[PDB]
C-alpha cells in the first residue's frame, strides 16, 4: 500500500481510492506504457553530451 | 453564489483552491470586459487589441495565439465564447505563478490582492477586512440526499429471523449493533433498549401489540421474549443439548 520511488512516471502517487484498499488499487500515469514483457515503461527524452 | 468556510483552508493545506479562486476572479474579469464590449457593440479594433493582450500575458508562456491572423467573424465568435470568461490553462506542475494571476487580475480593473469588500445581504453594512471572492469550479457529487434519505415505521420483515429488512430499497431498518447497545447501557435507558430488541426488532407478538397500542394511543409495550432467541434455543436443542428455560 506504500508508494515506492519506482512509481515515478508509471502509476499515480496521488490517485488511489482512500478507505479499505488505499494503495491496492492504483491509477496508471499519463504517458505510462506497458513493455513487451509486461512492465510499466514511461518515456524519457535522451540526453546526449549536453 | 456560494459562501465557503475559510477555516478548512489553513489546516487542510490546499492553497490551490485559493489560487484557483483568484484565477477564477481573473478569468471572469476578462470575460466581463469582453461581455461589456459586446454589450455596446464595440468595433473589433477594441476587441482584437484587448483579447490579444489577454491571450499574451505572464512570463514566456508556450502558448502563442496571434489574433492578427484571425478572420473577423471568428473573433466575434471567439468573443462570444469569452463573454462568460476566458478559460485559463494551468498545467499541472508548469502553470500559473502567483505574479501572473495578479498581472492577469490587473488586466481587469479588479484589486490585485484577490479580495474585494463585500456587503452583508440582509443588513447592508459591510463585512470589514475584505473578503476573497472568485470563481471556483464546484462539482455536484453522486451523494444526493434523494438517494440517502430513508425512513421506516413498519415495513416488510425478514423470513428467516423476524427482523426488519436490510437496505433502503427493501424498506429497511437501521442496524442497532453492539456499539449502540453499550452506549445505551451507558445511560440508564433500560426500557429504550428492551424495545430495541423486542418491539422494534423481532418479537412478532410484541410488535403487533405495539402498533395497535400506538394507534390506540397507549405507549406501553408488553414485550416478552425475542424471536432471535427462540431460533437460538431451537438451534442448540438441535444439538443434543437440553438447554431449557427454568421457572421463577
Amino acid at each position: 500500500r506504500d508508494v515506492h520511488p519506482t512509481h515515478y512516471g508509471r502509476v499515480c502517487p496521488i490517485e488511489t481510492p482512500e478507505g479499505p484498499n488505499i494503495g491496492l488499487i492504483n491509477s496508471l500515469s499519463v504517458y505510462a506504457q506497458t513493455n513487451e514483457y509486461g512492465f510499466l515503461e514511461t518515456p524519457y527524452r535522451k540526453v546526449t553530451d549536453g | 453564489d456560494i459562501v465557503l468556510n475559510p477555516l478548512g483552508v489553513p489546516s487542510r493545506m490546499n492553497i490551490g483552491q485559493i489560487l484557483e479562486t483568484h484565477l477564477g476572479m481573473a478569468a471572469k474579469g476578462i470575460g466581463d470586459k469582453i461581455n461589456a464590449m459586446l454589450k455596446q457593440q464595440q468595433e473589433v479594433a477594441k476587441l482584437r487589441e484587448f483579447i490579444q493582450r489577454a491571450y499574451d500575458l505572464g512570463a514566456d508562456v508556450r502558448q502563442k495565439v496571434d489574433l492578427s491572423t484571425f478572420s473577423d467573424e471568428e473573433v466575434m465568435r471567439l468573443a462570444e465564447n469569452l463573454r462568460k470568461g476566458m478559460p485559463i490553462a494551468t498545467p499541472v506542475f508548469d502553470g500559473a505563478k502567483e505574479a501572473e494571476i495578479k498581472e492577469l487580475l490587473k488586466l481587469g480593473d479588479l484589486p490585485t490582492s484577490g479580495q474585494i469588500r463585500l456587503y452583508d445581504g440582509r443588513t447592508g453594512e459591510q463585512f470589514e477586512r475584505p473578503v476573497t471572492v472568485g470563481y471556483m469550479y464546484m462539482l455536484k457529487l453522486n451523494h444526493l440526499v434523494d438517494d440517502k434519505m430513508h425512513a421506516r415505521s413498519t415495513g416488510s420483515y425478514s423470513l428467516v429471523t423476524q427482523q426488519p429488512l436490510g437496505g433502503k430499497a427493501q424498506f429497511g431498518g437501521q442496524r442497532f449493533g453492539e456499539m449502540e447497545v453499550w452506549a445505551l447501557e451507558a445511560y440508564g435507558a433500560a426500557y429504550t433498549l428492551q424495545e430495541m430488541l423486542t418491539v422494534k426488532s423481532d418479537d412478532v407478538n410484541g410488535r403487533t401489540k405495539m402498533y395497535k397500542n400506538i394507534v390506540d394511543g397507549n405507549h406501553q409495550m408488553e414485550p416478552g421474549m425475542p424471536e432471535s432467541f427462540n431460533v437460538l434455543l431451537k438451534e442448540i436443542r438441535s444439538l443434543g443439548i437440553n438447554i431449557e428455560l427454568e421457572d421463577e
Binding site: H7 | L7, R129, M225, E235, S238, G240
Partner: protein
C-alpha cells in the same frame, strides 16, 4: 417469566419427547406442486400446516376446524407459525458419538473414560475392540484389542469376551461406568498418592466427576442414538422468482444423515458383510459430525458452492452467527437515516428532522392522533389521508412531534454521546439538521455523514430519552468532566475576533455606561468591534450564602468584550471575557459557568455563545487569501546557509573525515534546524504587525492576519500547518520510518515541483493508509473492555470501607505533570484529612470532594489525601456509590444502578482512539529550587573531607519548601558525591549530588585500616596492574575465569583498627568485611589510612500508542522482569553459574527458602550483605505487574497500572479521570488463589472469584470457626473475561462450542443477572432504570 436458563445434556427419551414425529425420507418437497411430503424432511404431519388453519389435503381447510387432525394427510389444523417451533427426531440405526463431546480439546468423553483421545477415535472408527466387563478371562476393562489380537485372544476363552468396536463400545463403556463408585475409589487412592502429577491428574479428573454427579446428566447421553431435526422455518425452502428456490445448508446435512441412516438401516436389514457396514456406520457418524459442526473433524465439506456449508454450530458460533450477529446487532423499526447539515438556528436540545421522515417514522402515532381527533374514521381512511398528506395531517403531526424525542445516532458509536435524544423540529428538505455544538460530541462533520434517527415509543423510553439522553442532560464528557460542547471553530473565531484589541481603532478611550451603550455604539457604526474603552460593568459574585452579591466597577476593556459580557450569566466575573478568548478560554469560560451556576444556565450560555460567535464571525468577514501567507524574507538565506553546510559536510565525507551514516545524520540535523529557523522567522514575522497610532508613532501589535487569527485562536489548526504554508515544508518521511534527506525547501504559497511532490506522497499515503486502517478497528479495545467490565453496576450507597489509594500528583523529577486537583476531585475521602498542623479535620469522611473542598485543601497545601477507591470496595458484584465517587457526566454523586463498567470501557476506548494506532518509543543534579530535603530510608555516613556518600539503598531525594508539598524528587545514586548534608535548608544554585555511573562505591561506615584476609590473587581477583599512575589495583572477578577453589569464597573488605583489632559494625556483632560482587574498581592496599566513606570499590556503568494500552491491560510478562526481594531480611548469594546465580535472602527472624535463579546477565543493584525488605528492587527495568500484586498490596498494582496507563494518555495529551482505569482493574483481579484452605470450603490449589471468597470468609468467620487466607491473582483482560459466571453471556464473546460443552456437562444454570445476559434474553438490563425491576423481581423470590 422463566427467571433462569438451565443447560444440560439431552436425554434420548427427551429428544423423542421434543419430537413430533420421525423424519424418514430425505425428500424435501413435492417437486411439482412444491408441497410438503407425507414423511419427508419438510413434513406436515410432523411440523405442521403450510397455510394458517388449512390442511395439506384440502378437506379441513376451514377456520372452524381449528385444533383437529385430518384423517387423509395427518396434519393438525393450526397456525403455520407452529412449524417455527416444532421439532422432530431421527432414530439413528446405530449409535454415534457427539462430536462436541469428543473432538473438543478437553474432550469430555476422553477425559471421562480415563483413556486418551487416540484410544476412543481408534475404537469409534472401527479399528479396535474394547473390553466391557470382561469377567476374569485374562484381560483389562477399557483396553484396546486390535482385530487380530481380539481374534486370537477369543481363542482359549469360551466366555463371550465382550469386545465391541464403534459407538456401541463407547456407549456400553459410558453406561457401565459408575461415576460415584469411581469417585470413592479415586478419593481412596487420593488418600495415598500425594505426588505432583499423580495427585494433579486425580483431582483434575475428580473435578469433572464431582460435577457430573451433582449435575444430573448421564454419561451415556454423550453417545447419541436419536437425532433432533430443526423446525422447517429455521432451514426454509423459500420460493424465489421465476421458479428458482433457495435453501439453507442444514437441509443438505440433514439429507446426508437421512440418506446414510436409511442405507445403514437396509445394510443391517440385509445381513451384509461386516466391512461395508463398518464403512456405512463410519460414514453416518461422519455425517452427524458434518451436520453438527462442519469442520471440527476435517474437512468442512462443500456443496455446489465452493465455500463450506454452515452447520448448527456455525449457526450459533461465528461472527455471522446468531450469538454475535443476531442477538445484539439487529435492525430496528421506527428508524431511518439521512445526511446531517448544520442549521444553527437550533437550540442545544433540538435536531432538525425532515418532514417526509417525520411522516414516515411517526405513522402509528399519526394514525392514533388523527382518528382520536376524528379527522379520519377508519385506519384505512387515516392511511389514505396521510398517503395523500392532506393539509390537516401536518397539523396533526406537528401536534404529535411536540415533546417527543428522537434518538439521533451516528455509526461509530464509541461512547455514550454517540446517542443523544433531541426534540424534533420539522424542516423541509431531506437532511437532518443538527446543532453545531454536538458535532464535536459525535465527531460528525458535514462532508456527508449520515445520522440514524430512532423513535422512543413508550413513555418509559420517552422519559429515558428526556431524562438521560437529552443533549442538554449530557454536556459533560463522561470520560473527564470537562464540557464536551466546547465551541469548535467558527464560534471561537467570532469570540476571538470581537474580543481582541486594536491599538488605534475607532472610538478609543470613550466611557460607556455599560454593555448596552457598547452594542448601540458598535451597531450604529460609531465604534469598532475592538477599541480600548472604559465600560461600566455590573458583575455579580456569589461569594456569600448563595447570594449573587452585585458589584459595579469601571473596567478597562474593549467594545466587543463589553458586547460579549451581555450573554454572560450573573455568577461569572468580568475578567473571564477581558482577554483574547481563544479556544481554551471558551472551554474554561463554559467550565466556570457550569461549576458556578449549574446545568441550565450553562446550556443557555452555550447557546448564546454559539449565536454570538456565528454572528460576529459573519460580521468579521474573516476571509483567507494568497497574501495571508507572508513568506519570511530570511528563508532564502537560511536555505542557502543550510545548503552551504551540507556542502561542507559533503566535502568532509568526500575527505573521509566522517562516514555516510554520520553524514546522513548531520544533514538531517542541519535541515531540521534550518526548518526550525525558517518557522521561527515566519512566526515572528506573522504575529507582530505595525500599526499607527493615537499619537502617530510606530507601535507593534498582534496582527489581524486571518491565517494568524485562525492559528492563534485555536479555531482550526496550529503553527505547524502555518509552517507548511509560509515557511519551508521540511524533511519528509518514508513508510520505512526513515527520513528523506533531501528536504522540501518550498511550501504551499509557492509551489512544489515534481520531485518534491513525489517525495511528499510517501508520508501522506502512509498517513492515509494508517487512518483508514485504524477506522476498520476503531472500537476493538472498547469491545475488549466491555467484555471484562460488562456486569459492574453501582449497587450500594455506601459499603463502608476504610481502605483506598492515597493520591499524590505526578512529580517526575522537576515539575508536576498533573496536580492534585486533577486527581482527588470527585473522589471520596476514605479517612479524615488533617491540616499540615495535624490538628483539625479539614474534610470529615464519606465526603464528595467537589471543587470547593479541593480548593480548600489546595489552599491548605495538603499533599497526601487517601481517597476512597473502587479496588477496595467492600461490596459484592458491584461497587458502592462512594467507592466510585461522582458521575462525571453529571456532576452529582453517582446513582444506584449506573453501568460504570461499560461507561469506563467507553471512556478508555473513545479517548483511546485519539492515541496512535501504532506504537512509538522515544554529571551533577540540576538544583533549581530551594527548601528542605526530606529522605526516606536515610542512613548516611560522614566523610573526612566534608562530602557525603549515602550507604543505604533506596534513599531517594525529596525536596520540600515551607508549604509541605514536594519540590524536587529524584533518585540518589549509591554513593554519589554529595555536596548535600542532612536536613539543612539550602538555597538553589548549588549541586546536591555529583553522580557518575562509573562510580558505585562500597564506601565505609567507620574509618580505619582496610587490611585483606582470605585474599588470594589468581583464584579470586585478576592481575590488575594500572600503568596509568602506578597504583595497586585489585579488581575482583565474576565466576568466569577464576578457579573453583575460590569461587564460592568471597574476599574481605575488612576495615580494622590502627593496631589491627577487628572493629565492629555499629549495631551488629558481625565484622566489617564488605565482600564484593563482580567488577569493582578497587584502589586499596593492605594497611592504608582511609576515612569513613572512602571510595574503595567503584562499579562501572517512554512508549506511547494504543498498543501500549493494549499491553498494559492484558498484563504481559515482560522478557526482562525486574526481579524483586521476595521477603524481608538481609541478603546472601547462592550457587555460582549453573546457568543462573542463586541468591538467598535470609530473614533475621524468618525462614529463607528463596535462593532465586538469578541470571548473571542481569547485574545486581544490591550488594550481597545489604538488607532489603519485601517488595524491593534487585534488577533494573520494566517491573512485572504480577510481582507487584504478590509482594506489595492491591493498591500498589492499582497505583502502578493507572499511572502507567495515564502515562500513555497524558503523553499524547488526552485527559481522562482515573476512576475509569480503576473499575477495569477492579474487575481484572477478582481472582484469588487459596493457600490455607482452612475451614473454608475450597481446595488448596483453587482459583475462584474473590468476592465469593470474601463472603464465605465473611460467614465462616461469622461462626466460631476460622476462615481462609488467599493470595490475590491478576489476569489479562482477554483472560479475565473468560472466567465469567454466565454461559449465555460467555458464549457471545468466547468460542461457543467450548463454552456450551463446558456448560452442558456441568448441568449448569444461569440465574441471568448481567447486562449481556438479559439483553440477549430480551429483558430489562440489571443496570439502568431496570435496576428497580431487578429489585421488584428479587423481592418476589424472598417472598
Amino acid at each position: 417469566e422463566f427467571d433462569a436458563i438451565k443447560i444440560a445434556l439431552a436425554s434420548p427419551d427427551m429428544i423423542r419427547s421434543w419430537s413430533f414425529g420421525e423424519v424418514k425420507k430425505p425428500e424435501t418437497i413435492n417437486y411439482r406442486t412444491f408441497k410438503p411430503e407425507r414423511d419427508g424432511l419438510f413434513c406436515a404431519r410432523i411440523f405442521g400446516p403450510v397455510k394458517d388453519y388449512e390442511c395439506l389435503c384440502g378437506k379441513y381447510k376451514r377456520l372452524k376446524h381449528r385444533g383437529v387432525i385430518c384423517e387423509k394427510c395427518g396434519v393438525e389444523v393450526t397456525q403455520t407459525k407452529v412449524r417455527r417451533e416444532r421439532m422432530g427426531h431421527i432414530e439413528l440405526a446405530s449409535p454415534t458419538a457427539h462430536i462436541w463431546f469428543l473432538k473438543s480439546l478437553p474432550s469430555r468423553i476422553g477425559l471421562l473414560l480415563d483413556m486418551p483421545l487416540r484410544d476412543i477415535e481408534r475404537v469409534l472408527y472401527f479399528e479396535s475392540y474394547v473390553v466391557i466387563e470382561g469377567g476374569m478371562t485374562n484381560l483389562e476393562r477399557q483396553q484396546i484389542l486390535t482385530e487380530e489380537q481380539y481374534l486370537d485372544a477369543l481363542e482359549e476363552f469360551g466366555d463371550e469376551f465382550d469386545a465391541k468396536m464403534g459407538a456401541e463400545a463407547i456407549q456400553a463403556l459410558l453406561k457401565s461406568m459408575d461415576l460415584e463408585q469411581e469417585c470413592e475409589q479415586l478419593r481412596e487412592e487420593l488418600n495415598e498418592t500425594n505426588s505432583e502429577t499423580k495427585r494433579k491428574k486425580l483431582t483434575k479428573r475428580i473435578k469433572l466427576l464431582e460435577a457430573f454427579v451433582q449435575s444430573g446428566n448421564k454419561p451415556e447421553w454423550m453417545i447419541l442414538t436419536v437425532l433432533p431435526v430443526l423446525p422447517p422455518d429455521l432451514r426454509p425452502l423459500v420460493p424465489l422468482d421465476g421458479g428458482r428456490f433457495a435453501t439453507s445448508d442444514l437441509n443438505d446435512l440433514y439429507r446426508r444423515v437421512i440418506n446414510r441412516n436409511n442405507r445403514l438401516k437396509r445394510l443391517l436389514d440385509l445381513a451384509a458383510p461386516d466391512i461395508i457396514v463398518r464403512n456405512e456406520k463410519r460414514m453416518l457418524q461422519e455425517a452427524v459430525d458434518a451436520l453438527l459442526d462442519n469442520g471440527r473433524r476435517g474437512r468442512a465439506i462443500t456443496g455446489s458452492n465452493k465455500r463450506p456449508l454452515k452447520s448448527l454450530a456455525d449457526m450459533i458460533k461465528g461472527k455471522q452467527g446468531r450469538f454475535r450477529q443476531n442477538l445484539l446487532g439487529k435492525r430496528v423499526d421506527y428508524s431511518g437515516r439521512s445526511v446531517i447539515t448544520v442549521g444553527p438556528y437550533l437550540r442545544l436540545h433540538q435536531c432538525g428532522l425532515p418532514k417526509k421522515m417525520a411522516l414516515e417514522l411517526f405513522k402509528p402515532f399519526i394514525y392514533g392522533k388523527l382518528e382520536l381527533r376524528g379527522l379520519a374514521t377508519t385506519i384505512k381512511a387515516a392511511k389514505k389521508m396521510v398517503e395523500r398528506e392532506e393539509a390537516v395531517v401536518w397539523d396533526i403531526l406537528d401536534e404529535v412531534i411536540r415533546e417527543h424525542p428522537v434518538l439521533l445516532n451516528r455509526a461509530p458509536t464509541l461512547h455514550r454521546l454517540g446517542i443523544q435524544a433531541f426534540e424534533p423540529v420539522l424542516i423541509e428538505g431531506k437532511a437532518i439538521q443538527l446543532h453545531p455544538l454536538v458535532c464535536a460530541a459525535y465527531n460528525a462533520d458535514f462532508d456527508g455523514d449520515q445520522m440514524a434517527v430512532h423513535v422512543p415509543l413508550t413513555l418509559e423510553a420517552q422519559l429515558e430519552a428526556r431524562a438521560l439522553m437529552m443533549s442538554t442532560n449530557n454536556i459533560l464528557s463522561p470520560a473527564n468532566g470537562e464540557p464536551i460542547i466546547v465551541p469548535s471553530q467558527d464560534v471561537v473565531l467570532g469570540l476571538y475576533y470581537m474580543t481582541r484589541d486594536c491599538v488605534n481603532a475607532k472610538g478609543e478611550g470613550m466611557v460607556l455606561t455599560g454593555p448596552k451603550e457598547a452594542e448601540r455604539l458598535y451597531r450604529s457604526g460609531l465604534a469598532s468591534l475592538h477599541a480600548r474603552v472604559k465600560v461600566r460593568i455590573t458583575e455579580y459574585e456569589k461569594d456569600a450564602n448563595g447570594e449573587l452579591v452585585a458589584k459595579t466597577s469601571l473596567k478597562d476593556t474593549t467594545v466587543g468584550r463589553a458586547i460579549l459580557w451581555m450573554i454572560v450569566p450573573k455568577g461569572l466575573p468580568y475578567s473571564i471575557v477581558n482577554q483574547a478568548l481563544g479556544k481554551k478560554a471558551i472551554s474554561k469560560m463554559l467550565n466556570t459557568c457550569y461549576r458556578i451556576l449549574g446545568l441550565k444556565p450553562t446550556v443557555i450560555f452555550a447557546d448564546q455563545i454559539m449565536y454570538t460567535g456565528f454572528a460576529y464571525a459573519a460580521r468579521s468577514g474573516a476571509s483567507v487569501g494568497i497574501d495571508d501567507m507572508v513568506i519570511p524574507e530570511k528563508k532564502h538565506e537560511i536555505i542557502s546557509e543550510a545548503e552551504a553546510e551540507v556542502a561542507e559536510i559533503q566535502e568532509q565525507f568526500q575527505s573521509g573525515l566522517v562516514t555516510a551514516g554520520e553524514r546522513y545524520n548531520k544533514v538531517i540535523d542541519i535541515w531540521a534546524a534550518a526548518n526550525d529557523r525558517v518557522s521561527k522567522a515566519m512566526m515572528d514575522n506573522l504575529q507582530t504587525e505595525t500599526v499607527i497610532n493615537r499619537d502617530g508613532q510606530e507601535e507593534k501589535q498582534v496582527s489581524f492576519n486571518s491565517i494568524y487569527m485562525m492559528a492563534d485562536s485555536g479555531a482550526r489548526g496550529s503553527a505547524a500547518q502555518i509552517r507548511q504554508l509560509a515557511g519551508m515544508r521540511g524533511l519528509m518521511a518514508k513508510p520505512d520510518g526513515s527520513i528523506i534527506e533531501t528536504p522540501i525547501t518550498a511550501n504551499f504559497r509557492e509551489g512544489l515541483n515534481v520531485l518534491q511532490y513525489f517525495i511528499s506522497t510517501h508520508g501522506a499515503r502512509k498517513g492515509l493508509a494508517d487512518t483508514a486502517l485504524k477506522t476498520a478497528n476503531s472500537g476493538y479495545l472498547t469491545r475488549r473492555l466491555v467484555d471484562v467490565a460488562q456486569d459492574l453496576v453501582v449497587t450500594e450507597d455506601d459499603c463502608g470501607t476504610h481502605e483506598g489509594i492515597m493520591m499524590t500528583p505526578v512529580i517526575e523529577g522537576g515539575d508536576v505533570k498533573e496536580p492534585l486537583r486533577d486527581r482527588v476531585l470527585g473522589r471520596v475521602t476514605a479517612e479524615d484529612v488533617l491540616k499540615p498542623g495535624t490538628a483539625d479535620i479539614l474534610v470529615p469522611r464519606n465526603t464528595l470532594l467537589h471543587e470547593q473542598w479541593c480548593d480548600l485543601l489546595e489552599e491548605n497545601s495538603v499533599d497526601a489525601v487517601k481517597v476512597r477507591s473502587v479496588v477496595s470496595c467492600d461490596t459484592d458484584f458491584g461497587v458502592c456509590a462512594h467507592c466510585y465517587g461522582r458521575d462525571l457526566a453529571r456532576g452529582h454523586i453517582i446513582n444506584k444502578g449506573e453501568a460504570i463498567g461499560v461507561i469506563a470501557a467507553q471512556s478508555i476506548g473513545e479517548p483511546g482512539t485519539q492515541l496512535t494506532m501504532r506504537t512509538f518509543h522515544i554529571s551533577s543534579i540540576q538544583v533549581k529550587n530551594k527548601g528542605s530535603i526530606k529522605l526516606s530510608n536515610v542512613k548516611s555516613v560522614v566523610n573526612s573531607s566534608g562530602k557525603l556518600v549515602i550507604t543505604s539503598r533506596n534513599t531517594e531525594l525529596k525536596l520540600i519548601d515551607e508549604f509541605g508539598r514536594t519540590k524536587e524528587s529524584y533518585k540518589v545514586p549509591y554513593g554519589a558525591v554529595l555536596a548535600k548534608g542532612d536536613g539543612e535548608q539550602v538555597a538553589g544554585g548549588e549541586t546536591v549530588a555529583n553522580w557518575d555511573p562509573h562510580t558505585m562505591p562500597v564506601i565505609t561506615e567507620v574509618s580505619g585500616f582496610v587490611r585483606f584476609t582470605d585474599m588470594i590473587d589468581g583464584q579470586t581477583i585478576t592481575r590488575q596492574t594500572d600503568e596509568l599512575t602506578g597504583l595497586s589495583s585489585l579488581v575482583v572477578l565474576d565466576s568466569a575465569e577464576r578457579t573453583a577453589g575460590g569461587k564460592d569464597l568471597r574476599p574481605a573488605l575488612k576495615i580494622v583498627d590502627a593496631q589491627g583489632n577487628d572493629v565492629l559494625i555499629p549495631g551488629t556483632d558481625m565484622p566489617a568485611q564488605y565482600f564484593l560482587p563482580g567488577k569493582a574498581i578497587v584502589q586499596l592496599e593492605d594497611g592504608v589510612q582511609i576515612s569513613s566513606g572512602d571510595t574503595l570499590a567503584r562499579i562501572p556503568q517512554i512508549t506511547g500508542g494504543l498498543p501500549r494500552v493494549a499491553d498494559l491491560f492484558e498484563a504481559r510478562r515482560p522478557k526482562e522482569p525486574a526481579i524483586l526481594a521476595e521477603i524481608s531480611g538481609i541478603v546472601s548469594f547462592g550457587k555460582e553459574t549453573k546457568g543462573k546465580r542463586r541468591l538467598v535472602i535470609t530473614p533475621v527472624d524468618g525462614s529463607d527458602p528463596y535462593e532465586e535463579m538469578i541470571p548473571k546477565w542481569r547485574q545486581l543493584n544490591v550488594f550481597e550483605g545489604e538488607r532489603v525488605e519485601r517488595g524491593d528492587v534487585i534488577s533494573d527495568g520494566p517491573e512485572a505487574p504480577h510481582d507487584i500484586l504478590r509482594l506489595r498490596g492491591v493498591h500498589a498494582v492499582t497505583r502502578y497500572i493507572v499511572n502507567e496507563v495515564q502515562d500513555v494518555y497524558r503523553l499524547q495529551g488526552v485527559k481522562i479521570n482515573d476512576k475509569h482505569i480503576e473499575v477495569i482493574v477492579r474487575q481484572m483481579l477478582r481472582k484469588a488463589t487459596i493457600v490455607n484452605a482452612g475451614s473454608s470450603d475450597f481446595l488448596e490449589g483453587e482459583q475462584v472469584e474473590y468476592s465469593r471468597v470474601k463472603i464465605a470468609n465473611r460467614e465462616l468467620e461469622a461462626n466460631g470457626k476460622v476462615g481462609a487466607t488467599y493470595s490475590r491473582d491478576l489476569l489479562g483482560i482477554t483472560k479475565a473475561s473468560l472466567a465469567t459466571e454466565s454461559f449465555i453471556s460467555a458464549a457471545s464473546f468466547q468460542e461457543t462450542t467450548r463454552v456450551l460443552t463446558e456448560a452442558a456437562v456441568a448441568g449448569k444454570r444461569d440465574e441471568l443477572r448481567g447486562l449481556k445476559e438479559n439483553v440477549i434474553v430480551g429483558r430489562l438490563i440489571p443496570a439502568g432504570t431496570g435496576y428497580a425491576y431487578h429489585q421488584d423481581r428479587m423481592r418476589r423470590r424472598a417472598a
